[PDB]
Every structure is written in C-alpha cells, then in structure tokens.
Design a protein around this ligand. Structure first.
Ligand SMILES: *[C@@H]1O[C@H](CO)[C@@H](O)[C@H](O)[C@H]1NC(C)=O
Ligand SMILES: *[C@@H]1O[C@H](CO)[C@@H](O)[C@H](O)[C@H]1NC(C)=O
Ligand SMILES: *[C@@H]1O[C@H](CO)[C@@H](O)[C@H](O)[C@H]1NC(C)=O
Lengths: 120, 111, 75, 495, 75, 50, 49, 49
C-alpha cells in the first residue's frame, strides 16, 4: 500500500527530493519515517512526519539538511536532502508506523530509492 | 550512544541462535525494542515489535528477549534464511530519534 | 456572499429595466412573509416586546415591523 | 491514551442503586466513568451511520436553455399562446411589446408576447432522507488500564466496539478481564432524523433541517423522477428580460453552488460518499456496571523497583499521566501508587486508573491520577527503591468550580434538557429539573426558532433592560434571568 | 437567492463546528458596518427619525439600530 | 462588468466592495489573488484535524 | 471605447497542493514553506495533541 | 537541558532587489510580481502623475 519514487542519480552539491505515495488509510492514520541505508552500512533514521498533522521531526544529524513534507491532496510524502555529497549515497526507505510517540513498529515499507551520487 | 550490536554472528541449521543488543538507560530499558531482518538487496522486515512480540508475518520459531538494558532475538530452529544483517531499533529519549544498532550480519554455516 | 450586497440603491437607474427588477422587486418581502409563517413563535415575542417598549401605537408598530424585518435579514 | 488528549473529555463518577449511570455520548467528546469499586472506563461515539437513504428532492443548482420560442399577438387580440407553454420541461413568461405598422401588426398598441425555453438541469443536489430505524451508532468502550492499547495488524484485544441500533438498543460489551458492560441506549431520542435531510452536493454533504430543505427557492424534482424534465420552480433559475418593450429574452441565472454553500452556513457537514456517515450529534445511553469488576484485584503489591520511562505529563483535564516500567519479581502485581504531601502524612490525590497492575516485567504501564491543586508528590513503589515524584498543579478550587459550572452551562446549551441525563443516577431533583427544562426549552425554541445569534443578543439585551426597568420584583427577576440566559445562548450559539 | 435563507436558527446544532461558522459569525455585522461607512447620509436620517419617533433614550437607540440594520439587509 | 458573455453597468464603489478574490487589473501573472479567504473554507470540526 | 481593466474578481477556483504543519503545545507555531508563497491560502488553528 | 526554539527575531536586516510599480489614476492598483513572494516587504502609496 506504500509506493516510493523511482531511481534517481544525482551530482555532488545538489538537492534530491524523494516521493512516497501512501494510501488514504495510511495517510490519515499512520506516521511515515525516512530511513536511509548507505552502501554496505547499517540502517539510519532520518526523520518522520504525521501526514495528517504534518509537523516533521529529524535526527539531530540531519538538522538543516533534510526536509520531509506531505501532500494531503495527492496523499504523498516527500523527503528533500540538501548538500548532497559522496557520503549521502544510500538507499532511502519510507515506512508506515503508528502516530503514537512510543511505538515505532514499521509494519509497511516501500522498495527504496537509490540516490546514486556518481556519474554513469 | 547508539545501540551496540554484534557485527558478526554465526550459527548452524537446526540450532537456536540469539542476537544481543545493548543500549543505554535512554536507548533500551526505557523504550520498546524492535528487531529487523534486512536481507541483501531488500528492505528491512519488522521481526519483533513492542518488546519482543511477534508480528503475524514472522513464524513462531522467531522470538525475542528484552532485559533491563538490553534485548535479544531468539530463533527456534536455524536455516540459511537467517543469514542476513540484523538491526535493533529503539527510540532514544536523549538522542530524540529512532536509533538503530550497528547492524548484525548473521552467518549460517552449511556452505 | 456577493448575493447579500445587491446593486439596488446605487442611483444609476434609467428607464431601461434592470437585471432582475421583476424578480427581485418582491423577493425580500416574500422571504419575510415565509419566515414569519414558519416562525410564529418569534412573531408573538416580537409583538409583545414592541408593545412593552413602544409608548405609543406608532412606536409599537414601528418596532414590531423592524424586528420582524430584521430577524430574517440577520439570518 | 486516546481519551486522554481530547479536550472535550468528561468525567462521570458514581453509580446509583443498581450500578447504572446515565451518560450522553457526543461525537467530538469522551466520557470517562468512575465508580466506587469499578474499573475506570472510556466511552467514545466514533461512528453514526444512516443506511438505505431515500431521496425526496433533487434541487437544480445549474441549468441551461436550448429551445427558445416566442409568440406574439397584435394589440387588442388577447394574449398569445405557445405549444411549449403546456410542456413542463419548458419555462415560459407573458409580457408586452410595442407593435405598430413598422413592427408588422397593423393596430398600434401593446401586443401580448410569450417566450419559452427548454429548461435542462446540469447539476443538482440530492436531499436524501433516512428512516430513524436505519441509524447505527458505533461506540468504543476501552477499560482505561495502564496497559498499552496495542498496535495494529496483530491484535485488537483492548478496544471494544459495540454497535447500537434502534431495533437492538441494549447491547453488552465483554471487556477481557473486567467482566461485561451493558449499554441501554436510546438512539430514537437523538437527532430526530424524521425532520432531517441528508443534503449531498457535488462532493460534500450536510445534515439540514427538512422544512428548510423544502423551502429552498431552487427548481426541484420530486425524487421519484428518473427522467427529470418536470422541474417545479424553473422560474427561480431563469430571468426573463424585456429591455424597454421591443424584444423579450430569457437566460439562466448561473451555477448556484456558491450561493448554496452560503445558504448552508450553520448546517453541520456530514459524509455521504462511501455510505452516510455522520460524525456529529450525541447518544444517550444507560450504563450497567453490575457485571463489571476490576482486573487483578486478587494480587499482591509488587514489592519491586519501578522506573519512570516517560516523565510526568500534565493533561488539559487537571490530571497527570506517568509511564513506569517494572524491574522486579512477581510480574502480575499491583503497583503501589499514592499521591501524598511532602511528609507522606496525607493522601491528597486520587489516581484515575484504578488498580494499576503490571502484567509483564518490562512492559510499561502509564498511570493517570488527579493530584491536588497545591504541591503534591507521586510515590511509586515500596521502601527499597521507592520513587518520590514532585508535581505542582497550577489551578485552584474556585477556578475549578467556575470551569465546571461553565462546562455544565455549555452542555445545557448544546444538549438542552438532555444534559440532565449526562451523569444522572435517577434521582428526583434531576427528574424535576429535566421536566422544567423540557417546558422552558419548548417555550424558548418556539420563541427563538430561525433567529440568528446577533438577534439573540439584541433580544436578550432588550429583555434584560425591560426586566431591570420593571415595577414587579418577581417579574423583574424573571425577565433578568430570561435575558441573561438568552445572552449566554446567543454568545454560545452557532458553533 | 438561496443564499438569503442560510439555515442559521434551525436548532440541531451539535458540539461539532458547523459549515462556514467562523465567517458567518461576523459576516452580517461586517456588511452592515461597510454599508454604514459607504452610506452615512442615510445613517444620519435614521438617527434623526429614531430621535423624533423615540420618546425615551432606549426607544431611540433601539429604533436606530433596527433601522440601520434593516437598511442594508432590506435588499 | 463582464462575467462570462454578460455585461453590467455597475457602480464603481459597489464593484470595488465586492467580497471575492481579485487581481489589481494591472496584474499580469494572474496568480496573486488577494482576499482569497472569501472563496475558501477552513474546517476543524472537533479540533482534531484541519 | 478603449476600456481599461480596473479589477479582476474570482468567481470559481480550485484548491490543490493541500499541506498541513503542526507544532505541538507550548512550542510556538508551525511553519510551512507554502506560507511564503502568496498563491497559497493558509489558516492557523489548534488541534488536540 | 534540551531547549526548544519558541521564536526567532530579526535585529539586523538588509534590503535588496528593490522594485516598484505604478498605476495611472482611476485605474486601480499597481501589480508587482515580487508582491506575490512573502520574502519581499511591500507597501502601497500614491504618487501624483
Ligand atoms: C429543440 O430543437 C432541436 C432542433 O435540432 C430539436 O431536435 C429538439 O427536439 C428540440 N427540443 C425540444 C422541442 O424540447
Ligand atoms: C503541487 O503538486 C504537484 C503534484 O501534483 C507538483 O507538480 C507541483 O510542483 C506542486 N506545486 C507546488 C507549488 O508545490
Ligand atoms: C536579486 O538580484 C540579484 C542581482 O543579480 C539576482 O541575482 C537575484 O536573482 C535577484 N533575486 C530575485 C528574487 O529576483
């Protein structure tokens, strides 16, 4: 029920926006978080948002570098990353979780968008 | 800081294996602990939610353990399926964000 | 609504008929009549209030008429 | 944690002889009921459904004209006639034009003229209705334990949704570990759906008065029409213009969607896309707690060490909620929770999570308590490792009484004479007051029907002035009371 | 039009906010104020007429507000 | 005043007092409508969502 | 002849790109990048949190 | 510990990209495209023409 954006290949110093389109039930009832997994590295939590409420919170590492927003009209969630660099290369996931402040059980995931910071 | 987790894990089919995730007073022992199985080239899968409660998807052989300041995932019977990277994610009150562990790649012998 | 601010008392009228002169000539009075019919309770209270406040029958009748015209108009 | 965090939460405390209590459930509110020896419960009305709606009109908000026809008779020869003038799918009007030798009549007078155009509807609003027997109220009952309400896709063992319909208005909810709760609701005394219309526009729906819907000045179909072509007040959606007395024309008046939206102010918006869902209105229910018992009353104190995993957070109802984990032996045990003073010599507050227990060691439980208005201390646990938590409550008893009185007055403003059932335990004073309120509400609704809030303010001021400048003391007091109540209702109305 | 009968004093108001309640709360007062601002000539006439017709100060003021409210909403 | 193949001769003050979104007339981008709140409704029924 | 446009009123509109933002109690006000643009219609309100 | 920014105030600002627009008398108001961007401070006035 969660569909992400297609693959994107970028260049250093740019900004990339990733699209995660959820269904109506998941948009009005659950939260959506952005986890990026670097090549050959562990999962990392970037941030999340309650799409119905829209207030986004980010990991302290990503303050001023990641923007997460929701499009209530199209029922979509976007993650925008600024200052793209070599270390920013990774796969990015959007996961569906409840909007309570205690439970982070991701029972739904997308498929990951490979933000390849390189030249091909 | 981050949930320290064992980088290397090894087991054999038919054997029970568990993974240890140790956090701080604000990482673990103060918030639920979630365990995820991430195979290569695939998105992470929620293994156990809350404090070691199995989602319907994971078979009964899967299970997890939670302690005062550490957590563990239990595997009833072993196979080559358990050869994957393992992550323990838990909300950190001081860090103010969902902090996973370092990631445990479980290796299943039999090759 | 734009419909609540019609173009009536603008002092631009000529011999040519206006947009909805025939329609809108009596629509306000018809609405007041319909409202009074549907709300006999407020009319009685307005009549009592006008009789009480009005010292003379001119004051009473004017107050009653104005109250009855206002009640639908504010709504 | 759902009923906590809703500003319209209500605390219903006490039961009568019979272990029942009267409660009115509103859609935007919550009721938390507490008895002397019963578990605290949370009651929410989360869904009202109207099924099998029947239309009764199809007002047109946008029409067009396609076949304009005119007929004229030379002066002195009487009114003309058109064949379409007997067609119900045609709009016609009679007028006069100047005629003479130049026009082609030959008599130099005012000749009757009639023009007709075919009226076709492009967009309409359906005023559906429902039978009062087809309503279905869904009410969730939650036992309000510290136990977490669980996460989706796995288990729903906490929330208990009971559907109530006029046919089956007495239903029983079996809450695991707390016995069963019986709700004796009266859905037939709610909105009075016989006098309501489900008005559905393009993609938006409203619940509106039926007489108001039937008095709308737009062309309408009876609702049994499948072909249309028989609109009633076609004249309201067209304008006939005879500039000077030369040529007679007719045109449509344009989409009435925005004017209709303006006309819908004060009507509550409902949903009618996937069924007729009304997230508005109340439901009066009688709650039976006879077969409702606290869970785990045969437990021993924990005698272990608790840790606060989430600091004390104050709610907007005067209570506090604290999240504590348990690191001790004998996992299913009672939590030793008290709210005392600094010296622990007096018990100052009451925990409204009665009988908190620890089902699992590491599973956190969040207790809710109502501390006093001064300084107070939350004591969790026993001598070894006891937690003493300081807390300060900012309000005051006089302010609390003022706020409670204001909430009662507001409840009377919305549920006029039905507020007397909100937390009633039977009683004789409640019955007398309800009867008096019914009489006064009948009089007030008769005298103030169809009146705006500004008109209510004006009338209240007028009546208060009349009372103040009155000869009789009793009449003066009665008029002042009526005027002040009218002012309060005009200030609180249209919400 | 249909906008002149706006479903205001029909009862059946619950605790859920109604359609366009915020705007409709003060739209009518706003339109009366704008009318009084744009048409001060009639307002003075209404004041004079209320003073002449009114015997007591309360009657004068009541007639004044009634006249000034009917004048714009009359059509 | 020209509204969709009908025209009216209105008072200038009455025209400028209309409560609708409008553009200055000198406007070219045609997107900075002002007084837009006259043609849009904002709902927070129970104070739970907007 | 030679008329000049004085004002252009809007009689029919469409709303798109709806988006919400929230700042929970006592922490101030929410921020939307859309509030910087004048072609977005914006409103502030309080929700229970 | 753990402060949350409630508000941010401007003490030293700078003006750039100043632009102006004019309308002849009786023809309404001038229109600046910048006036649609809330990042631009704007004011209306009258100048004899
Ligand atoms: C309107 O005129 C058309 C001419 O093409 C005709 O076909 C149609 O039947 C007419 N409709 C009426 C008379 O209702
Ligand atoms: C509005 O949303 C559409 C996607 O439906 C997007 O293409 C467009 O850029 C958005 N506009 C703004 C101003 O964000
Ligand atoms: C402001 O002026 C500078 C001057 O070069 C230009 O680069 C910049 O794009 C301008 N900003 C805007 C918003 O027009």
């Amino acid at each position: 029920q969660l569909v992400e954006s297609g693959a994107e290949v970028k260049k250093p110093g740019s900004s990339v926006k990733v699209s995660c389109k959820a269904s109506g039930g998941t948009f009005n009832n659950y939260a959506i978080s952005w986890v990026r997994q670097a090549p050959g590295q562990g999962l990392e939590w970037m941030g999340g948002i309650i799409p119905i409420f829209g207030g986004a919170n980010y990991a302290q590492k990503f303050q001023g570098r990641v923007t997460i927003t929701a499009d209530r009209s199209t029922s979509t969630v976007y993650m925008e990353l600024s200052g793209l660099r070599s270390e920013d290369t990774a796969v990015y996931y959007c996961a569906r979780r409840p909007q309570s402040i205690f439970d982070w059980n991701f029972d739904l995931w997308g498929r990951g968008t490979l933000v390849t910071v390189s030249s091909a | 800081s981050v949930l320290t987790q064992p980088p290397s894990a090894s087991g054999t089919p038919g054997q029970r294996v568990t993974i240890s995730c140790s956090g701080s007073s604000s990482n673990v022992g103060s918030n639920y602990v979630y365990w995820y199985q991430q195979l290569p080239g695939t998105a992470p899968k929620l293994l156990i939610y809350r404090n070691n409660r199995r989602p319907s998807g994971v078979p009964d052989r899967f299970s997890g353990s939670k302690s005062g300041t550490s957590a563990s995932l239990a595997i009833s019977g072993l196979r080559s399926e358990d050869e994957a990277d393992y992550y323990c994610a838990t909300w950190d009150d001081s860090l103010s964000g969902l902090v996973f562990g370092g990631g445990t790649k479980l290796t299943v012998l039999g090759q | 609504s734009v419909a609540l601010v019609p173009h009536v008392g603008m002092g631009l009228e000529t011999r040519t008929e206006t947009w909805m002169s025939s329609e809108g000539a009596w629509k306000h009075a018809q609405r007041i009549e319909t409202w009074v019919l549907r709300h006999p309770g407020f009319t009685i209270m307005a009549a009592i209030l006008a009789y009480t406040i009005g010292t003379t029958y001119f004051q009473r009748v004017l107050i009653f008429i104005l109250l009855t015209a206002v009640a639908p108009s504010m709504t | 944690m759902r009923c906590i965090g809703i500003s319209n939460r209500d605390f219903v405390e006490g039961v009568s002889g019979g272990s029942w209590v009267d409660i009115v459930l509103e859609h935007g509110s919550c009721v938390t009921t507490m008895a002397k020896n019963k578990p605290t419960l949370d009651f929410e009305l989360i869904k009202t459904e109207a099924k099998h709606p029947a239309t009764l009109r199809k007002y047109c908000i946008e029409a067009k004209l396609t076949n304009t026809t005119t007929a004229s008779r030379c002066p002195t020869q009487g009114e003309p006639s058109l064949n379409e003038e007997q067609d119900k799918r045609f709009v016609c009007k009679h007028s006069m034009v100047d005629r003479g030798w130049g026009n082609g009549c030959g008599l130099f007078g005012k000749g009757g003229i009639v023009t007709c155009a075919m009226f076709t509807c492009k967009k309409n609003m359906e005023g559906k209705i429902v039978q009062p027997e087809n309503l279905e109220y869904t009410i969730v009952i939650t036992p309000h334990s510290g136990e977490e309400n669980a996460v989706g896709q796995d288990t729903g063992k906490h929330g208990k949704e009971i559907k109530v319909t006029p046919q089956s208005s007495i239903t029983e909810a079996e809450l695991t570990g707390y016995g069963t709760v019986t709700m004796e609701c009266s859905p037939r005394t709610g909105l009075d759906f016989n006098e309501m219309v489900l008005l559905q526009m393009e993609n938006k729906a409203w619940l509106v008065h039926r007489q108001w819907f039937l008095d709308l000045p737009l062309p309408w179909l009876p609702g049994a029409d499948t072909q249309g072509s028989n609109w009633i007040q076609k004249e309201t959606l067209v304008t006939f213009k005879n500039p000077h007395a030369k040529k007679q024309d007719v045109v449509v008046l344009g989409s009435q969607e925005g004017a209709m939206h303006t006309a819908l102010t004060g009507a509550t918006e409902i949903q009618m896309s996937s069924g007729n869902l009304l997230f508005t209105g109340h439901l009066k229910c009688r709650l039976r707690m006879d077969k409702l018992q606290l869970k785990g009353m045969s437990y021993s104190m924990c005698t272990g060490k608790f840790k606060v995993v989430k600091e004390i957070a104050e709610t907007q109802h005067g209570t506090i909620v604290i999240r504590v984990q348990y690191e001790g032996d004998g996992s299913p045990c009672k939590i030793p929770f008290e709210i005392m003073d600094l010296e622990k010599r007096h018990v100052l507050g009451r925990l409204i999570t009665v009988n908190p227990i620890v089902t699992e060691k590491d599973s956190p439980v969040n207790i809710e308590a109502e501390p006093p208005f001064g300084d107070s201390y939350i004591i969790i646990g026993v001598e070894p490792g006891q937690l003493k938590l300081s807390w300060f409550k900012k309000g005051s008893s006089i302010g609390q009484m003022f706020e409670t009185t204001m909430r009662g007055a507001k409840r009377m403003a919305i549920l006029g004479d039905t507020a007397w059932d909100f937390g009633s335990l039977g009683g004789v004073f409640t019955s007398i007051g309800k009867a008096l309120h019914q009489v006064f509400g009948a009089i007030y609704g008769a005298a103030f029907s169809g009146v705006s809030w500004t008109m209510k303010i004006l009338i209240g001021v007028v009546i208060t002035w009349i009372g103040m400048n009155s000869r009789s003391t009793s009449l003066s007091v009665s008029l002042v009371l009526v005027g002040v109540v009218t002012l309060y209702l005009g200030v609180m109305v249209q919400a």
